[PDB]
RNA sequence: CCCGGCGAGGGGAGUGAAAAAGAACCUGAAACCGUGUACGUACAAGCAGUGGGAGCACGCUUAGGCGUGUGACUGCGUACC
RNA sequence: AGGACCGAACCGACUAAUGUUGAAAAAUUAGCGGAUGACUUGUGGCUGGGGGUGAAAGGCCAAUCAAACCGGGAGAUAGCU
RNA sequence: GUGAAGAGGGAAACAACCCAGACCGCCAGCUAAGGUCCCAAAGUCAUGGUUAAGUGGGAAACGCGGAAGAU
RNA sequence: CACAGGUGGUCAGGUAGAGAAUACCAAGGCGCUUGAGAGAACUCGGGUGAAUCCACCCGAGACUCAGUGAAAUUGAACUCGCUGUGAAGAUGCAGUGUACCCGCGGCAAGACGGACGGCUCAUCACAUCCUGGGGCUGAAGUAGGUCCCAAGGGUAUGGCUGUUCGCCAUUUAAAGUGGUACGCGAGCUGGGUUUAGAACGUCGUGAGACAGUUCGGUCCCUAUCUGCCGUGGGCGCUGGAGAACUGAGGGGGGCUGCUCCUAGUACGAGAGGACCGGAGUGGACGCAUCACUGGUGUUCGGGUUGUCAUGCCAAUGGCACUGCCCGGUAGCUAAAUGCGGAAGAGAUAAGUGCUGAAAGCAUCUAAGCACGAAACUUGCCCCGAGAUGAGUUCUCCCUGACCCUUUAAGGGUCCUGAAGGAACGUUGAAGACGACGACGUUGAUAGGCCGGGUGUGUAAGCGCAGCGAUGCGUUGAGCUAACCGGUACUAAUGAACCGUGAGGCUUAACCU
């Protein structure tokens, strides 16, 4: 503990944290833009980027894994058809964080979106 | 006599011909070049300042850049001092290799303990206070192998601190 | 009329002798909370006051040494029923 | 048929902890005990203060009992702060 | 006799120890106990003596010793 | 109090279920009154934008827990230690020493915090006891009494007496003796008294009390400063600033069993029998590490019982302690060890000594004049110039102008804004909060990706066999958070604030 540790404390149940991560990832892949605190945005990016990278390759196993980790038929249907080819030539950095001004001393807020988000 | 400064990279085990496992620590010892010489007449005592590593010119402060340019040497990551044993005197810009420890077989290692949170009385003494960010000196340690071309030094047992820390190796005063 | 949020509240103009009378509304001190004016305090030990005591701004006899606030230091100093 | 056994609701505070201006002027949590019998409970009424009640702790009688509250004796009281 | 009902000065401190009974004010001088190296105001004053252990600056009986005292 | 506590009856479904119990579901109700903010009027310096009328945001002063806000207490506090006196341990009296001002996290030498009694491992003496190791006592054994690093502050029966109790008897692992208010009645309790009800009677004008009666019974509060440890904001070391060290002072530990030969040598008639501490070998404790020897590792894989869902299977996700187990990445620990407590030196009590008397002897000393015990200090590991006596060394920067006065450690205005720091982001092996290391386009600081490593175990699909289960090649496959070397794919942009503009007075030496 306190040495070479990844991930904030995030005091809560592990299952609740996983459900929250899945919900935020689904929201991001659906709307391609979210407003949330910097730690939450970073956690969402960390949890979603592996899914996007896996979705780059179209296969039955990849689709099944995405469905298992997302539990949304519509979301997986959207994936492997648009996001894949859109970011096929890009390795990493599929999401960007923009500072939307302010709390400053209570909790920061920022927008998390895709590299393009359109076109 | 004089000690060098190295960087910890890792620790592993070494097997001898007879088949004995001895813990060793990976320490990279860059050639320390003397930057300043302090004498009795001016500074009041005999000493030599040693610099190791390198830093980007952007982050190097102008006073430090001027001090390094005075000695005509590249700017390093820090400065260290060692007290001479009334022996031969070095000169500014004289690079020092790791050959000195190649014929001593006994060295002492000084490092910085890794930081840790507040510890209870039982944890510390078995008085509460700050743990880590403190000196750690280990003596009576014998160098296992010395590699001049690789600048790699091995010492029996472990050494203080974690990977990437800076340690100081000095001749074993006790004898 | 303006700021304010199309509220509350505040600032102007007017009425009002007076708004240093605005519905918390005659006269308006203290304990308590902030700002400004002048001074002491980051090498200095105890009922925190008493005399001496260099200065710091101002008004005085328009200097000639007085008073409006402070004492760095120094002799003395174990509150009341 | 069990003052029978295990085991829900339910009942007892028997034990430990939570607090002693508390969440409550005696309550809460975790175990323990009974769980067809001397069981419990919804509602209605009776037993009244030198008294009633009390499987006798002189327990309880409106969060108080070795004799409760209100107004009068009483602006009471020997001694005392 | 003091305090009880008296201030002040000295004994380093202190209520019973010594001098000393404050009407008030004045940047004056002289005494008592106590001091005159400093702290702290005053002779590092003068003469005749004991003292080598800091006894002074804490001690009984007893043959200089006796003599061991409190973070 | 919209309280967390209490309130009597009826409606009583599905699955695995003997069950109205257990776990999830049908219709229905909820995600809880602390977890989380805007730009906060106004004021300053700025850059950006069509050339008066200005518009956008940053770096700041001005709110901050998105906050109302109570709590016993409080004569005034500028609230240090030691020694002596004191109605008796003096933060306040006399003498002496130390300490920069104001905060934060822990430990209580103790504040006589505040409103009798013993149950007391942390600093103390007797064997102290919230359950480590011991040494002695011609101890018959167990056991007492004597001693160490030490304070089980929850507990026996009893004489002197009042009981746990102040002296002690039997004591076992203690039933226990005071320092600190016997550390707390800011813990408990009465177990006998003055005090929960009886209780012989008392000293006592009375108050006040009877450590005297036989049984005794219900005792309250949310760290105020202070001492120690660590860590912060301001200021000063005299122009400012960044680094590296000397050093006045201060911090804690010097434990202990065996053997090899040295040497069965010396000494010693014989018996007897070392100095040798020359080298290795154990245990208690301290620093540090995870490659090795065990755990955790609710973030990783696999197996499995019930239940809801993906329209059904295969296969998955949610719940049942992480639903229950096999493990286990990095990290954190000990159940594992590299080192440590040196060697040596100074002065030492006792003791051992070169020449040597006074007083033709003697003798450790009178003259010349030397060693030495686990005692003391260096030597071993250190911090430390707030040491105001404020140190030493190296380096970087400012080289302007004008006006006025009460004409000097003077004041004011325009411009300049150096080195350095802070402001914000990535962040860490730094972290309660501060603070500290590295980077910010002149880049691997963080995220992801590439290949590898560890872990887990034969993922799904396909065709065959078994008329079920299930197996075969696909396949040492799939997945892998924290590990390794690169990748700018993404985020740290151009920037802006403080901080200056030649540095006071006196004196000695150099050309004027």
Author numbering:
A (entry chain N): 1 to 102, 104 to 120
B (entry chain D): 1 to 126, 161 to 209
List sentences from the manuscript.
The proline-rich antimicrobial designer peptide Api137 inhibits protein expression in bacteria by binding simultaneously to the ribosomal polypeptide exit tunnel and the release factor (RF), depleting the cellular RF pool and leading to ribosomal arrest at stop codons. Separation of cellular extracts derived from cells exposed to Api137 in a sucrose gradient reveals elevated levels of partially assembled and not fully matured precursors of the 50S subunit (pre-50S). High-resolution structures obtained by cryogenic electron microscopy demonstrate that a large proportion of pre-50S states are missing up to five proteins (uL22, bL32, uL29, bL23, and uL16) and have misfolded helices in 23S rRNA domain IV.
To test this hypothesis and provide direct evidence of Api137’s ability to bind to the precursors, they were incubated for 20 minutes with 30 µmol/L Api137, representing a 100-fold excess relative to the ribosomal fraction. An additional focused classification step was performed on the pooled classes with a fragmented or absent density for uL22, using a local mask on the uL22, Api137, and uL29 binding sites to ensure that uL22 was absent in all particles of this subset. In addition, both the (L22)- ~ H61 class and (L22)- class showed a less defined density for Api137, indicating that the peptide can bind even in the absence of uL22 but remains more flexible. Two trajectories could be followed, one of which showed that the peptide projects linearly toward the uL22 binding site. Interestingly, this conformation would sterically clash with uL22 if it were present.
